[PDB]
Design a protein around this ligand. Structure first.
Ligand SMILES: CCCCCCCCCCCCCCCCCC(=O)OC[C@H](CO[C@@H]1O[C@H](CO[C@H]2O[C@H](CO)[C@H](O)[C@H](O)[C@H]2O)[C@H](O)[C@H](O)[C@H]1O)OC(=O)CCCCCCCCCCCCCCCCC
Ligand code: CLA
Ligand code: CLA
Ligand code: CLA
Ligand code: CLA
Ligand code: CLA
Ligand SMILES: C=Cc1c(C)c2cc3nc(c4c5[nH]c(cc6nc(cc1[nH]2)C(C)=C6CC)c(C)c5C(=O)[C@@H]4C(=O)OC)[C@@H](CCC(=O)OC/C=C(\C)CCC[C@H](C)CCC[C@H](C)CCCC(C)C)[C@@H]3C
Ligand SMILES: CC1=C(/C=C/C(C)=C/C=C/C(C)=C/C=C/C=C(C)/C=C/C=C(C)/C=C/C2=C(C)CCCC2(C)C)C(C)(C)CCC1
Ligand SMILES: CC1=C(/C=C/C(C)=C/C=C/C(C)=C/C=C/C=C(C)/C=C/C=C(C)/C=C/C2=C(C)CCCC2(C)C)C(C)(C)CCC1
Ligand SMILES: CC1=C(/C=C/C(C)=C/C=C/C(C)=C/C=C/C=C(C)/C=C/C=C(C)/C=C/C2=C(C)CCCC2(C)C)C(C)(C)CCC1
Ligand SMILES: CC1=C(/C=C/C(C)=C/C=C/C(C)=C/C=C/C=C(C)/C=C/C=C(C)/C=C/C2=C(C)CCCC2(C)C)C(C)(C)CCC1
Ligand code: OEY
Ligand SMILES: [Cl-]
Ligand SMILES: [Cl-]
Ligand SMILES: [Fe+2]
Lengths: 30, 37, 30, 36, 334, 341, 62, 451, 56
């Protein structure tokens, strides 16, 4: 169970990365 | 040892290798002279 | 012995600043 | 107020520290603290 | 145009969400191969005989590790500095036993991060920027080359390279202290100044700029909305930050030129970390930290211990226990 | 104008070195922390407290001089010069370690003074006091390491001695007895310091490499007027660079400098907390699961077990001389050692 | 001729020592490009001769 | 104000040597004067080493880095590297040092008196950085000069007394080379060797024939390239690939020098042919192999059968197999089994170390060398306490190999930084945005958003 | 008990600093005055730091 848990958290972070790059709030020039 | 003829120059010879560092220092004495224009 | 060493390097060392000094008096081309 | 040029005091003062420090490294090899 | 020109134009395009570039053509494959191997070895690779003494160290999560203890283990001392590609093994099983993943990961990683650095230059050229961010990155890059490549070379073995793990790194640091007295090495003292000072100046700059933010918001909204992206004008009063900080210390220990202040921020940590990467890189060749062991003695000749001698007793503790089964002869000469 | 008001006037005068009310605390305690350090690393021994030399006078160099902690037998005494131990005798005070408490406590009140000075100057100039707030992390470190940690231990003996190599010894003590590298509070502190160093370097380099051409010479420093309105570098080109190089980028200058404050300040605070634990020997020393397996399975080895073996060598090899007051006698045959070495 | 080689040798050294300070001051002083042309061109041949003379004397003492 | 201040030249004092970029005559003086400094140091240092040199101590016990370079060239040395005539050291010393003064003189003249710029005084010496024909011609001249230099080494080896040959029997001796290796299968086989363990790229060159023959090829290669470039102009492809500027050429050479310092570093660390251990002390690998040899010898004398002794791990305590089966020394030194040295190769057989030779044929000179080398391993502290980091003060030693390898790694690293700095700047300056971004035409502002 | 309270005491020091500053600097919590001149922060203009009444 502990291996699954460490792997799951690591895998959530990689998915965070993807959304934070590709689905960021686009910076725009007000 | 040096050749015994040049023994009286042993202490000159001990200090000679550091002379190139004094050139670097001399450049700063010089720019201080010209006020770092 | 070491006064020999220190007296040589005393003279060699001041040699540089003196050049700068002389060239200032003559309003040399510093 | 400025009779001695700054570039001179700099050189004098520098070679003064160089000496003091130079001496401290000498003492690292002589007398107390030299392992001898 | 022709096909090669379309490709060149896509490769170097400043309109791609992530810049690719010529350096990026080498970086992408090499970083991907390093990362995939690393993730899979960290989770599933079987024990590795790091020290070449048929005494395998388990590094992976499935063989009873956690995040803190796990590692990709350096390759066998029996291999030394020999190249150990997968295809030089008789089987994957032999490759896993002898630590091949480590070689594959660090070489692809060093290459990709070398090209990460060149990519930084390259994108800055396409954008019309000044080019020296990549110089800044050279400090961390140089550091990584030291623990993963230079130090193996000096010592004859990638088995003495820094492990890819949290506890493996600590192992590396302790052993390094016993064999090199890195704490007594000025280049590491310069590294610590680099990173303590880096953090100091980081906190200072952030605190000082934040102190002098221009009232542009109400007390119920984040002050951060006082800044609008791209905006022409500055959002803090540097004159005010100087006036505060010059009084904190004195007027000329404080910066009033923003460019000189930011160049100082860049240079202080970068230089310090260069020195500490040079520290590892020259201790790789056994020019070690200062040795003041039994340096003070009394008129008779008894040793009068100093803090250096106390450090040396710790060092000896690390020396005599590390790799406890790998020494047959009395001096640990590599 | 009352006399308090006239004294305010003079203390808050614009001079080369601002004084303030906070000065009355800051300058005297700071000078004496500094002074007693210089004095004590130049002239004072650790022979009676530690069995060590520790001054230039004895032949130590800049790296090995220390003002060393008082003997363990003093407990947590304040070691006042006029107190029961030294009884007003200056020489005996120096010899029993009084300069350590002198430095420790004058330094503490000087740090107070400095933070108040940060507050006092902020108020008069009219800026927000985020710098004083940032100074709270150095104070948490100093208090945790130098005061709280020994107060939980047997005596001031085990606080840090004020010296370059004395501090290195402290580092290694903490590895061998506390396994402090394994401690998550230290790990967060490492992240904040190395991360702050990172922010420091990357921010400085970005500004330097996105500058606008505001002059015509190759020395770019002279194209900045502290009173100009305009940003001196391009946030927009900075953002695009890092967006395409690293995938994300700052877009907000305020948040960026607030983050620079936050990261190293929060990291030192986290490390302070771990040291408060260690005051009590409440360490993250072991992983129980690894130990139960290792005890039962002689073929199970990890970097975690390899490091404890090193810890074990540090403790036994260094303790007799590092804690002389314990009169530890370890025969050769009990010393842990691997093969040959 | 032992003492005669030490003669030439400190000649070299007391000539180098002059030529070292003198040549750069001579050069960056505007006054005497010509008043000092002869000086340096002489000390030069003098320097060289001294080196050569010391070079042959070595093989009579060293 | 002939440049020489910041208002006119655009560079501040701390980058004042960039004021010289387009002052060919002052720039010529800076280089000659600086060459002066290099040849001065060769001269002062050698004499310094001579004054401090005791011929009865090994070179490596006395902090010497330049005299070992002279000894390797075959001067002043006899069998086993014994010093037999110090006079040549003196000569190298004085001649360089004398020579520094003429160099000295020439640089200070050009940097002060002479024309600041050369291009109107004589059309041959003056140059424009952007003249692609003039640059390749200077390159060609220097190429030829280098090629000659390489052939000077060949001349010393073949016609003028030979080179120290650590592999020459009887324990090493100077020796004239008569059959240099010309087969380019060998000479250029070294270039295609892996730089990894057991191959060593060109660092592995282990005999003086290959060394001399490589320098015939390189000399002739440089002389032929010199002519090439003197007669040619860069082709279309090369013009479109490079930046043609003073600073870019500088960055190309900083690149080159960096690469070379790193190679030097590994040369002095691993190679015991053109850095003989007689002179430089043992290599790190050598010292560690020597330790295992020393303790093999001691225990065999006591009665140990060293081929059948199982150590604690299950591997042989003295001898084990490398991963391709060779008999090698055991213990940690298993990483060093690639080591080859004259003291050790007599025990080597077709399958590696030969147990019959180990049981019968170890001579006292091998025992001595192995003990000497084990106790001059290149470990020491920065203040020159010899040994491991935990050693007590007493032995005042740091191996020349450590000094030469650490100094040149440091140097090669900073010269790679220099490359990146100046290459980057040269590209920016050529594109015209090295002073910053043009507010009125900011490039990113004319680009579409990423998202 | 001891661990938690010493830890909590330490953190609460930081809250004292945070809330103390916000009381004494409430006026500029949202930012510094956008119309503040160097006569007020630069050196010498005022004999007492901050006091506009101290010209020259
Ligand atoms: C633009 C160019 C880009 C090119 C990039 C792609 C090229 C890949 C090269 C990889 C190099 C790394 C592996 C080197 C490992 C190693 O064993 O390299 C060492 C080898 C020497 O190999 C050793 O060479 C020895 C040769 O000695 C033998 O022969 C001798 C004969 O005297 C002796 O007898 C000795 O006993 C005997 O063993 C043996 O072969 C050893 O087993 C073998 O390890 O050196 C070498 O080939 C010399 C060169 C070493 C590489 C230089 C180091 C690079 C440093 C990185 C700097 C970081 C930069 C900062 C970034 C920020
Ligand atoms: C200091 C030495 C030096 C320098 C700086 C130059 C510089 C130059 N040479 Mg010259 N050259 C030299 C020595 C030198 N040469 C010598 C000694 C020879 C004799 C063989 C030549 C022969 C020569 C020829 C025949 C040509 C040049 C050309 C050029 C120009 C283009 C070079 C180029 O593209 O770089 C190299 C850049 C490349 C992109 C080449 C890519 C090849 C790969 C990436 C490198 C690996 C190949 C390598 C040579 C072999 C591998 C060794 C490996 C095992 C380590 C440039 C001005 C060219 C020119 O325009 O002539 C007028 C040309 O055609 N040179
Ligand atoms: C190897 C080191 C080196 C060399 C060769 C040079 C050389 C040069 N520099 Mg650079 N420089 C250096 C280091 C060096 N510098 C460093 C470290 C700094 C930073 C402080 C600078 C900062 C700098 C600036 C700011 C400027 C130069 C300039 C120059 C050039 C003209 C200088 C001039 O007018 O002197 C004038 C000074 C004097 C006449 C005073 C005396 C100098 C002489 C040469 C002393 C020689 C002493 C020697 C012992 C002679 C006796 C030996 C004899 C027997 C042979 C010249 C080619 C200038 C330039 O580019 O001009 C356009 C310029 O403006 N440099
Ligand atoms: C690559 C160049 C190089 C190398 C490998 C060496 C190596 C050596 N030299 Mg030499 N030396 C050099 C350049 C070099 N030197 C130069 C340029 C000078 C002129 C100043 C000298 C002058 C010199 C003298 C006068 C003496 C030596 C001696 C020695 C030995 C002891 C070094 C020591 O204790 O360091 C101590 C270490 C330091 C001082 C650290 C310096 C590192 C700086 C501060 C940081 C790096 C700066 C830069 C970024 C690189 C060692 C064999 C000694 C010896 O044994 O004589 C036979 C001796 O007395 N050297
Ligand atoms: C690469 C270095 C170099 C270069 C390119 C130049 C180039 C120049 N110099 Mg400088 N100069 C140098 C070094 C250099 N000099 C040195 C070292 C000195 C001091 C000895 C001088 C002293 C000097 C003075 C005092 C004057 C010049 C002048 C000139 C110009 C004309 C020279 C001429 O026509 O000679 C023609 C060439 C010859 C007659 C060829 C024979 C010269 C020797 C014998 C060549 C031997 C090469 C050597 C053996 C190779 C090995 C060197 C070393 C590795 C051992 C020209 C711009 C003149 C000037 O500026 O105009 C007023 C001038 O008055 N130079
Ligand atoms: C005819 C053209 C020519 C030649 C042959 C040289 C030769 C040389 N120059 Mg170059 N130079 C030239 C034109 C030339 N220069 C021009 C036109 C400029 C621009 C004005 C420069 C600018 C320049 C600079 C800036 C510098 C040089 C330097 C050097 C020397 C390199 C030191 C070296 O590698 O020695 C190491 C030793 C070896 C590589 C081997 C041994 C040396 C051999 C025996 C010398 C033989 C040289 C001889 C003249 C060549 C034969 C004729 C040839 C045409 C076939 C070398 C003697 C450097 C120097 O030291 O000058 C003081 C330097 O800093 N040069
Ligand atoms: C080794 C680490 C280290 C040192 C030496 C250091 C030093 C300093 N930091 C300061 C400031 C700061 N530091 C900050 C964040 C940080 N500071 C950090 C790390 C350090 N900071 C880190 C890592 C951070 C990130 C959070 C901020 C935000 C500030 C400031 O605003 C302030 C400043 O102006 O920065 C430039 C200055 C405080 C001036 C003062 O109190 O004077 C008064 C002096 C007194 C009261 C004496 C202190 C007595 C000491 C505590 C004990 C005696 C010590 C001996 C004299 C010396 C012993 C030496 C041996 C131990 C080797 C001072 C230069
Ligand atoms: C070989 C020989 C010779 C020659 C020699 C020579 C060539 C010399 C040189 C010399 C030199 C070459 C010297 C120089 C010196 C210098 C100096 C001594 C400097 C110092 C510096 C300083 C001290 C600095 C300071 C400063 C300043 C100024 C500014 C800024 C700041 C500072 C602080 C940095 C003779 C003749 C004897 C003879 C015998 C042999
Ligand atoms: C304790 C006490 C006290 C007080 C004291 C004090 C206050 C003192 C002072 C003292 C001091 C106040 C001193 C000072 C000192 C100083 C020093 C000793 C310094 C030195 C330095 C140096 C040596 C430096 C140099 C350098 C370097 C190192 C590097 C870079 C460069 C230079 C050059 C800068 C009292 C009274 C209460 C009494 C009781 C107790
Ligand atoms: C340009 C310039 C510069 C630089 C300079 C230089 C780098 C120089 C060089 C110079 C040089 C490089 C010089 C040299 C000289 C040398 C000499 C002066 C020599 C002499 C020799 C002799 C006299 C010898 C003798 C002897 C013998 C034979 C035997 C043994 C003993 C004896 C050693 C005594 C500077 C940065 C400052 C500044 C600006 C400009
Ligand atoms: C002497 C000797 C020898 C030999 C030698 C030889 C024969 C060598 C060769 C050498 C070589 C043969 C080298 C080569 C090199 C190459 C290089 C180093 C290259 C580079 C290139 C580059 C750098 C490129 C770049 C680029 C690209 C790629 C793209 C576009 C852009 C650019 C152009 C930038 C031996 C070892 C046997 C032995 C001993 C001695
Ligand atoms: O430090 Mn100790 O030394 Ca460099 O090797 Mn010899 O022992 Mn082992 O393998 Mn990793 O570690
Ligand atoms: Cl270990
Ligand atoms: Cl071993
Ligand atoms: Fe900033």
């Amino acid at each position: 169970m502990e291996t699954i848990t460490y792997v799951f958290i690591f895998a959530c972070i990689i998915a965070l990365f993807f959304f934070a790059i590709f689905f960021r709030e686009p910076p725009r020039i007000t | 040892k040096l050749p015994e003829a040049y023994a009286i120059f042993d202490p000159l010879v001990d200090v000679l290798p550091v002379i190139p560092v004094l050139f670097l220092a001399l450049a700063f004495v010089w720019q201080a002279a010209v006020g770092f224009r | 012995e070491v006064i020999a060493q220190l007296t040589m390097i005393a003279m060699i060392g001041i040699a540089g600043p003196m050049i700068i000094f002389l060239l200032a008096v003559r309003r040399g081309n510093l | 107020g400025g009779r001695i040029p700054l570039w001179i005091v700099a050189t004098v003062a520098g070679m003064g520290v160089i000496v003091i420090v130079g001496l401290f490294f000498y003492g690292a090899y002589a007398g107390l603290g030299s392992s001898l | 145009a022709n096909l090669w020109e379309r490709f060149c134009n896509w490769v170097t395009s400043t309109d791609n969400r992530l810049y690719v570039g010529w350096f990026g053509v080498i970086m992408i494959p090499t970083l991907l191969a390093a990362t995939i191997c690393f993730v899979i070895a960290f989770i599933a690779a079987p024990p590795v005989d790091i020290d070449g003494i048929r005494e395998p160290v388990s590094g992976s999560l499935l063989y009873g590790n956690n995040i803190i203890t796990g590692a990709v283990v350096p390759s066998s001392n029996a291999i030394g500095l020999h190249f150990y590609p997968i295809w030089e093994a008789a089987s994957l099983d032999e490759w896993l036993y002898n630590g091949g993943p480590y070689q594959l990961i660090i070489f692809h990683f060093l290459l990709g991060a070398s090209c990460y650095m060149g990519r930084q230059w390259e994108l800055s050229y396409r954008l019309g920027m000044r080019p020296w961010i990549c110089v800044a990155y050279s400090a961390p890059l140089a550091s990584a080359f030291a623990v993963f490549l230079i130090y193996p070379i000096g010592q004859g073995s990638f088995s003495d390279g820094m492990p890819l793990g949290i506890s493996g790194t600590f192992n590396f640091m302790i052993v390094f202290q016993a064999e090199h007295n890195i704490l007594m090495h000025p280049f590491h003292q310069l590294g610590v100044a680099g990173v303590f000072g880096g953090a100091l100046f980081c906190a200072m700059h952030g605190s000082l700029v934040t102190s002098s933010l221009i009232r542009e918001t109400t007390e119920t909204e984040s002050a951060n909305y006082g800044y609008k992206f791209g905006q022409e004008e500055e959002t803090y009063n540097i004159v005010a930050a100087h006036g505060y900080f010059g009084r904190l210390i004195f007027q000329y220990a404080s910066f009033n030129n923003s460019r000189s202040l930011h160049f100082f921020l860049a240079a202080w940590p970068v230089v310090g970390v260069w020195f500490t990467a040079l520290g590892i890189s020259t201790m790789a060749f056994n020019l070690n930290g200062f040795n003041f062991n039994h340096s003070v003695i009394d008129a008779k000749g008894n040793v009068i211990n100093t803090w250096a001698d106390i450090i040396n007793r710790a060092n000896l503790g690390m020396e005599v226990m590390h790799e406890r089964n790998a020494h047959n002869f009395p001096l640990d000469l590599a | 104008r009352g006399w308090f008001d006239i004294l305010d006037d003079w203390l808050k005068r614009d001079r080369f070195v601002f004084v303030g009310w906070s000065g009355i605390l800051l300058f005297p305690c700071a000078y004496l922390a500094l002074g007693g350090w210089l004095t004590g690393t130049t002239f004072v021994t650790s022979w009676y407290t530690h069995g060590l030399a520790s001054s230039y006078l004895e032949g130590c160099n800049f790296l090995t001089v220390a003002v060393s902690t008082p003997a363990n037998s003093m407990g947590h005494s304040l070691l006042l010069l006029w107190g029961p131990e030294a009884q007003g005798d200056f020489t005996r005070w120096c010899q029993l370690g009084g300069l350590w408490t002198f430095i420790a406590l004058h330094g503490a009140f000087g740090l107070i003074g400095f933070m108040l000075r940060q507050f006092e100057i902020a108020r008069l100039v009219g800026v927000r006091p985020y710098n004083a707030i940032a100074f709270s992390a150095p104070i948490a470190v100093f208090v945790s390491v130098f005061l709280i940690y020994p107060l939980g231990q047997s005596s001031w003996f085990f606080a840090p001695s004020f010296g370059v190599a004395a501090i290195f010894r402290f580092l290694l003590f903490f590895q061998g007895f506390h396994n402090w590298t394994l401690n998550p509070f230290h790990m967060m502190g490492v992240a904040g310091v190395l991360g702050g160093a990172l922010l420091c370097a990357i921010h400085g380099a970005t500004v330097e490499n996105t500058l606008f051409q505001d002059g015509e010479g190759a020395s770019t420093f002279r194209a900045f007027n502290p009173t100009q309105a305009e940003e001196t570098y391009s946030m927009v080109t900075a953002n695009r660079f890092w967006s395409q190089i690293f995938g994300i980028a700052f877009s907000n200058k305020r948040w960026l400098h607030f983050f620079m404050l936050f990261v190293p300040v929060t990291g030192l605070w986290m490390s302070a907390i771990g040291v408060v634990g260690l005051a009590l020997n409440l360490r993250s020393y072991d992983f129980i699961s690894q130990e139960i397996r290792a005890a039962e399975d002689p073929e199970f080895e990890t970097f975690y077990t390899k490091n404890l073996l090193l810890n074990e060598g540090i403790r036994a090899w260094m303790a007799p001389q590092d804690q002389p007051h314990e009169n530890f006698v370890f025969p050769e045959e009990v010393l842990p050692r691997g093969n040959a070495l | 001729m032992t003492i005669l080689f030490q003669l030439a040798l400190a000649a070299l050294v007391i000539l180098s020592f002059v030529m070292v300070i003198g040549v750069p001051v001579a050069y960056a002083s505007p006054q005497d490009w010509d008043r000092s042309k002869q000086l340096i061109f002489l000390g030069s041949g003098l320097w060289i001769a001294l080196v050569l003379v010391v070079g042959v004397l070595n093989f009579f003492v060293v | 104000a002939t440049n020489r201040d910041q208002e006119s030249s655009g560079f501040a004092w701390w980058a004042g040597n960039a004021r010289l970029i387009n002052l060919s005559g002052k720039l010529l003086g800076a280089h000659v004067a600086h060459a002066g400094l290099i040849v001065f140091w060769a001269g002062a240092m050698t004499l310094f080493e001579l004054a401090h040199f005791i011929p009865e101590k090994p070179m490596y016990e006395q902090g010497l880095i330049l005299i070992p370079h002279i000894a390797t060239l075959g001067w002043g040395v006899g069998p086993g590297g014994e010093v037999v005539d110090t006079f040549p050291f003196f000569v190298v010393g004085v001649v360089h040092l004398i020579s520094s003064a003429v160099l000295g003189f020439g640089g200070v003249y050009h940097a002060i008196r002479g024309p600041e710029t050369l291009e109107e005084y004589s059309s041959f010496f003056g140059y424009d950085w952007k003249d692609k024909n003039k640059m390749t011609t200077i390159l060609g001249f220097h190429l030829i000069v280098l090629g000659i230099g390489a052939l000077l080494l060949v001349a010393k080896a073949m016609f003028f007394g030979g080179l120290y040959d650590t592999w020459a029997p009887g324990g090493g001796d100077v020796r004239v080379i008569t059959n240099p290796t010309l087969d380019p299968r060998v000479i250029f086989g070294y270039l295609l060797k892996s730089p990894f363990g057991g191959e060593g790229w060109i660092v592995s060159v282990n005999n003086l024939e290959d060394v001399v023959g490589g320098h015939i090829w390189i000399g002739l290669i440089c002389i032929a390239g010199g002519i090439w470039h003197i007669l040619t102009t860069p082709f279309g492809w090369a013009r479109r690939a490079f930046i043609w500027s003073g600073e870019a050429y500088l960055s190309y050479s900083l690149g080159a020098l960096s690469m070379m310092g790193f190679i030097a570093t590994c040369f002095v660390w691993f190679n015991n042919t053109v850095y003989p251990s007689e002179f430089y002390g043992p290599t790190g690998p050598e010292a560690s192999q020597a330790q295992a040899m020393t303790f093999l010898i001691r225990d065999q004398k006591l009665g140990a059968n060293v081929g059948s002794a199982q150590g604690p791990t299950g591997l042989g305590k003295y001898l084990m197999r490398s991963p391709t089966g060779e008999i090698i020394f055991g213990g940690e030194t298993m990483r060093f089994w690639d080591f080859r040295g004259p003291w050790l190769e007599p025990l080597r057989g077709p399958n590696g170390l030969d147990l019959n030779k180990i049981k019968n044929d170890i001579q006292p000179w091998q025992e001595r060398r192995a003990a000497e080398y084990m106790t001059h391993a290149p470990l020491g502290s920065l203040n020159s306490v010899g040994g491991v980091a935990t050693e007590i003060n007493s032995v005042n030693f740091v191996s020349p190999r450590s000094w030469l390898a650490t100094s040149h790694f440091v140097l090669a690293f900073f010269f790679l930084v220099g490359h990146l700095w100046h290459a980057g700047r040269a590209r920016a300056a050529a594109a015209g945005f090295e002073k910053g971004i043009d507010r009125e035409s900011e490039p990113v502002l004319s680009m579409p958003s990423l998202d | 008990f001891t661990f938690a309270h010493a830890v909590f005491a330490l953190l609460f020091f930081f809250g004292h600093i945070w809330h103390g500053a916000r009381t004494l600097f409430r006026d500029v919590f949202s930012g510094i005055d956008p119309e503040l001149s160097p006569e007020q922060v630069e050196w010498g203009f005022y004999q007492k730091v901050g006091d506009v009444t101290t010209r020259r």
